């Protein structure tokens, strides 16, 4: 395979110590170094099963080794590494209560937000106590699909199966529930560097950029970006300037700050949507300009590589092409969800009925 990297590494660091070379060149060199050491994540560290399929994933923001996960049957799990304290569990109905959105609480880490097929955007503890419901369908067969949160703004946002989005405060205060789309809202997210423009994606083959404080007039939006197929995810950058989008058939798109309408590059990659599989969500890496996605081969997709395996692919953002591929037998499932740690030293993967941890090996000999 490819993975060639080269450079005059330490020199640049000293160049940075002299002021000659600019910081983005440093960021590029250490991005390459990060890829080189990610070539040693090949040894899969840990595996974890449980009951009904995995649907949503989330990282403990402050802690590297802690992670939370939510199932197809409303079964939530909280798991920490190097603890061995037999991780924490909570069950649900198990049939039609699929948790589908899951973000940690920025305030109380022993709390968590959740969006469920039951029709209940809730705030609940890992010990089982429901602290507070935020919204409700009040009529079954109409449920939520999307959820996200912001701490700098102290806001909650959630999306439906019909095309209307809801926006609440941390203490209630609902001033929202206007309709935005014609179909289900697959993903949604707020800017981390801003507080008052939003992004939402839907089955309508359109992804919309809103201004949550200015617009109130039922599709008096700010921007609307089209696509050729429906969209499973539209995720913001940490920096805030790059919006990543991933469709259902075969595509990834990078939109910029600079003219949201036009895209900067198209990254073709197979992640074909499917009914009983968990929907695929590309994701950023929090401290570089990389992209990470899970692959799902299609015999009809125009493959550039002659070898098409199920594996975790890692591309470069501002170029378009690939830079690394992680693969491990005994894990021949399809990695629906993949998310790097906010810390930057660990990767979590959610496959059907399985959760995988990929971190570096070392510790050749103890003393």
């Amino acid at each position: 395979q490819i993975l060639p990297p080269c450079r005059s590494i330490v020199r640049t660091l000293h160049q940075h110590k002299l002021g000659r070379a600019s910081w983005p060149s440093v960021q590029q060199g250490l991005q390459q170094s990060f890829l080189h050491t990610l070539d040693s994540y090949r040894i899969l560290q840990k595996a974890a099963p449980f009951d009904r399929r995995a649907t949503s994933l989330a990282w403990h923001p402050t802690h590297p080794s802690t992670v939370a996960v939510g199932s197809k049957g409303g079964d939530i799990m909280l798991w920490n590494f190097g603890i061995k304290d037999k991780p924490t569990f909570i069950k649900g109905i198990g049939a039609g209560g699929s948790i589908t959105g899951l973000k940690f609480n920025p305030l109380n880490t022993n709390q968590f937000y959740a969006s469920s097929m039951e029709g209940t955007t809730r705030l609940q503890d890992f010990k089982g106590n429901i602290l507070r419901v935020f919204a409700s369908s009040d009529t079954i067969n109409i449920w939520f699909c999307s959820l996200d949160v912001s701490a700098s703004s102290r806001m909650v946002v959630t999306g439906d199966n019909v095309g209307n989005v809801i926006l609440l405060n941390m203490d209630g205060k609902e001033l929202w529930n206007l309709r935005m789309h014609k179909k289900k809202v697959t993903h949604v997210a707020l800017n981390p560097c801003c507080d008052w423009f939003l992004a939402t994606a839907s089955v309508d083959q359109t992804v919309k950029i809103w201004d949550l404080r200015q617009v109130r007039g039922k599709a008096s939006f700010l921007y609307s970006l089209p696509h050729r197929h429906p969209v499973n995810a539209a995720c913001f950058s940490p920096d805030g300037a790059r919006l990543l989008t991933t469709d259902q058939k075969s595509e990834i798109r990078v939109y910029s700050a600079s003219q949201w309408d036009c895209p900067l590059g198209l990254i073709p990659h197979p992640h074909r949507h499917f009914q009983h599989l968990t929907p695929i969500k590309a994701a950023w890496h929090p401290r570089y300009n990389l992209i990470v996605v899970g692959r799902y081969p299609d015999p009809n997709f125009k493959s550039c590589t002659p070898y098409e395996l199920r594996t975790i692919d890692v591309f470069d953002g501002n170029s378009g092409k690939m830079m690394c591929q992680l693969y491990d037998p005994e894990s021949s499932g399809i990695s629906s969800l993949n998310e790097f740690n906010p810390m930057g030293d660990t990767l979590a993967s959610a496959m059907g009925y399985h959760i995988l941890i990929w971190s570096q090996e070392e510790a050749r000999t103890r003393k």
């Binding site: 060639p4 590494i9 940075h16 110590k17 983005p24 940490p238 805030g240 700050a257 930057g344």
Partner: protein
Amino acid sequence: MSYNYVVTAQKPTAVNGCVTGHFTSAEDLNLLIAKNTRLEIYVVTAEGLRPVKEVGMYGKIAVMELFRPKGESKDLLFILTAKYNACILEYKQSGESIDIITRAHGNVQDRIGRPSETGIIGIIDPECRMIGLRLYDGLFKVIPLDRDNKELKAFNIRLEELHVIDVKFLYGCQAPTICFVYQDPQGRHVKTYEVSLREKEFNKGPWKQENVEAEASMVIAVPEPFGGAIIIGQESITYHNGDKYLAIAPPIIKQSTIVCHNRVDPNGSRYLLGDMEGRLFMLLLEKEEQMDGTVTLKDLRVELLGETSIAECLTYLDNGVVFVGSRLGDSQLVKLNVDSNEQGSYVVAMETFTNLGPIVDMCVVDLERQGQGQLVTCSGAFKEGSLRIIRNGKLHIRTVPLYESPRKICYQEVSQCFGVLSSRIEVQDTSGGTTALRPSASTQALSSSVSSSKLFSSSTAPHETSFGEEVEVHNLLIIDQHTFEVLHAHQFLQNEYALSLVSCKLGKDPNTYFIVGTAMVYPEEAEPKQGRIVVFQYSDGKLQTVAEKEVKGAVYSMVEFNGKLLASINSTVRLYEWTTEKELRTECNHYNNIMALYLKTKGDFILVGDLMRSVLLLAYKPMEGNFEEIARDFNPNWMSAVEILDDDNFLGAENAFNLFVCQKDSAATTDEERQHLQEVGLFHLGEFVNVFCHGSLVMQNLGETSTPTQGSVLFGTVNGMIGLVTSLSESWYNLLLDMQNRLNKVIKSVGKIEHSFWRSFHTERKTEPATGFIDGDLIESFLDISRPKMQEVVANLQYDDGSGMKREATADDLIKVVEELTRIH
């Protein structure tokens, strides 16, 4: 719970930018000089430079250009900071009062955007129709210069060209027009656009895009009567103007890249050019007449004028005099003569101005008197490289030129000498290896000893070298502390870079050794796979190799630890014992780091600073003979230096010019929670800190209990700034913070920048107000304002004088406090 005080001990000396113009009056020729946060204004005279005014700004100066709007009698000044504070300033003088007036100010930040690789570029059209800023890739920000635009409101124009290298406004255009060089997969090209303010858009430029040299890198806008643009590359110089196209490829310039330019003649007939080796050329434009009275370019020639300091910037003054502003070496005033000297140079130096930056390493030693600390820094780069010795009595500076790049310094009292790691550049010879471009310390020693090490000469696949590759040669120099003569130079192995240096004793062995950590550097390797720790003994005027340890990585850092050797090697931290057989033997290893670049120690505890995982606190457990992970800072920070303030307080500096302080979580109720360091201090310093070291240059008041500050750690920067960090009690912190807020209400900020904004922690991930840090510069600025302003500052201020109850402060109370504070540095 950690409260610290940071103050400037020596302001930055490197010059980042310089411009000339008519700022103080229409008849005066002024020189304005930017030294990061400082702006100096001089009047240019026949003999040299007269200082007229020096001001500080609350920002890193990134752009500085003079301009004169219609109806104005003298130049205005545009300044942009690194945090994107823009301002237009005008000089106003009456009597002995000098004021910097703010004509306009505003923040030009976008809500989102990635700063560009070649950084912020800012240019102003010669007819003052608009200011243009290249801040972010893919965007061109335009500030229309309307009389009403005192807030510097701007609009963005899309740039199809996403990777702009340089851009200028052209002269002689009926509509504002930019010309810029850009890169795409097809190569590099030069293109123009007209800028329509009316349409708030680009229009097609007056002349078509042209292909340029693959390494075309700079654009010069030529004044009337020529108009057009000059494109400077590494091997060629081209001129474009409409249907006119002229290129030259003089081989002489190919040896070194031209990196700066400045117009000599108002009509563009002559330019100065400076390269990375300090060579200075003249570029001359010979005119050709035309029947219609226009003037065109007939030919281009380059002439070598001589040698200067490696120039960041040049400004021609008058009468053959040039100011050479340097960041890597001394600045200069030079004279250009019409006739050359015996060696063929037309340049004669008139005056040299000290620049201490970059400070790559430093130590404090009592060179002359007990209790009288002096700072010894590694300063400079390539032929400008030097050591600098700084002692009080404002400051006395001795300069020791080395003519090559210093990297590390240590003091070895038992040998009465310093050890200094250095590197020099060599280029390929006619038939053999490589040859140096000039003499330097490592080639002028009384004696020298090549590294004949055969530690891994056997069973080590040698890597080829392509004919044409230049090489860096690294050396350990031993330099006498009294005469500063180069007593010895030890050359390291081929492709071996020396990174770290310490002088210490180890184990039970009474000898003192020089210990060096290295990396084997090969061009195709993403990270080093080979390195050495080498233990040398200096005796009988030479270094004898006592011991070596081969490791599979770069030895970034080493520190003496209780008679043992602590070393960081790529992603590992390792503790070695010094055996009876004078060998290094591994005692223990810690692995849970990405890259451990910086170490400091106190007692049996070890603070590890990582490149990207910023800091971790380990304790060596002497009763277990291994390491224990105590706690980590789980917030990411890209480190440049670290320091231990005390057993409970850890100081860090990062690449985005911020400082932070970490403490153990006092309110932690679990081992897991105890393992989380809390970032309790944050401060935007605005400098890139390479090194902290414990010590002080102020005379020690032996038995000076009851002072406002405790401890003294100095730090050195790229710009040649030296700062001091010391510790404060809570009550002093609260008093000084109140003083800061009151000062911030009274002090006129150049460009009307708020101090809180300036000092706010800022990276591309997060922006937060400063905490836990007092701005000593701000406190000291109390002393230069008038007495009535002082009285305003302390009105209705509660102050505890000595030991007692709080009462109202008078100006004299705080004068005394601040005066006492000035003596800590």
